[PDB]
Design a protein around this ligand. Sequence first.
Ligand SMILES: NC(=O)c1cccnc1
Ligand SMILES: NC(=O)c1cccnc1
Lengths: 233, 233
Amino acid sequence: AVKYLSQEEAQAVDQELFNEYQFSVDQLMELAGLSCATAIAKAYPPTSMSKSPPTVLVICGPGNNGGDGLVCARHLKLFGYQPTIYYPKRPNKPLFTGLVTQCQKMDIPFLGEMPPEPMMVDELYELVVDAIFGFSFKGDVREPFHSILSVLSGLTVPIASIDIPSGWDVEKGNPSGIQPDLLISLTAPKKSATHFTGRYHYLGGRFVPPALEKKYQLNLPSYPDTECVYRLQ
Amino acid sequence: AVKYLSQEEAQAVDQELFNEYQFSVDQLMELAGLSCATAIAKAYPPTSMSKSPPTVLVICGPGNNGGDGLVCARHLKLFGYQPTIYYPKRPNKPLFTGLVTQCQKMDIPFLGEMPPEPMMVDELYELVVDAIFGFSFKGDVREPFHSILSVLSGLTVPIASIDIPSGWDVEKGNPSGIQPDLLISLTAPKKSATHFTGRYHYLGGRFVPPALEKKYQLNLPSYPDTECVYRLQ
Ligand SMILES: NC(=O)c1cccnc1
Ligand SMILES: NC(=O)c1cccnc1
């Protein structure tokens, strides 16, 4: 029975990965990101899609979720998707700088603004990746995010959330939030992930050292062969 | 027809990845490394192996090949292998520092010395990963490497080379060198890889931007679905 994490649990575990075990943020983000694009490509394969190539909106927030998001975009390009990225609040740090520019020399479009009504989103993108807020977030959804979140939960087309449905109280979830169709739990799943309603819940981040796994008695599922994602249930 | 690279070609391409496209060395090394452990796990699966868990020697040199090597070790642990690492000449830089310590808190053994005769190697390890020298190397195999290379080409058990069979003149190859059974070409394959004799030749490093691919007219094979490795022929 794979454990779902308290907010403090996760941040400590995260803590070790950078502290004791010395994974750089570069490293794990790439894999977080790779896991994401993997999950998505599996969930919703291009063959099974309605356009060639299949369009996806990646909506990246200001912290790390954004990061994973950007990686994910780029791998999904590689995987055959035609992503567009909207990245409103960008911190001025080489990491995020780097990932942006990577995406840019992938001929990945960035949008300067969110289209205002969900119907136009639905019309321009087959899948929306929610890269806004992750575990460590603690309410106070400032603009423009409230406004995007607002649009998002109006969509017909499905949303893929990275780690957390943005704006779900990380433990509470949110009865009235956005209800994404795929939730890629990274590292371990989060208490909120029990409120998850949709059709795909992959786990990702094949990097937990078994010592860490036995520490925070995670009972991780065995990933198959060489995969970096596992479907749940 | 996938192009095999001149030494200068590769280093320029590499050059762009860090320059124009701004991939950090952290990033691409992880994927290089992940590709490697992938290739190996596929080539030689634990089920098909003779011990449980299947032992592997990873021999890491002083430059980047070593790096990929160390990553690879750790992913292969994750993949179900029981690797040991011998890492004689270690540069004092946080990158390599980091990867070591990662491996260490994976309960991965490091050897203090190379066992002297290949028969003992054969007896203690089912597969030897050659993480010594890559493309950019330019002869003058200094000790202890000549001595290890010497042991290596005496082995019964198979060798997996990362990017290059260490001590093959990167273009010439080496008729009388080590003759590894799996060669994981990273990014693109190298002129020497035409002299390759053994049974598995995977290509790896799913990160080439198609602009780069069209630039250095690489004609890369399409990786399947979400894989980070392709078997050749
Ligand atoms: N965003 C990440 O890289 C990450 C790292 C560890 C746990 N969860 C997510
Ligand atoms: N060692 C690596 O990360 C690498 C990067 C680019 C090309 N080949 C190998």
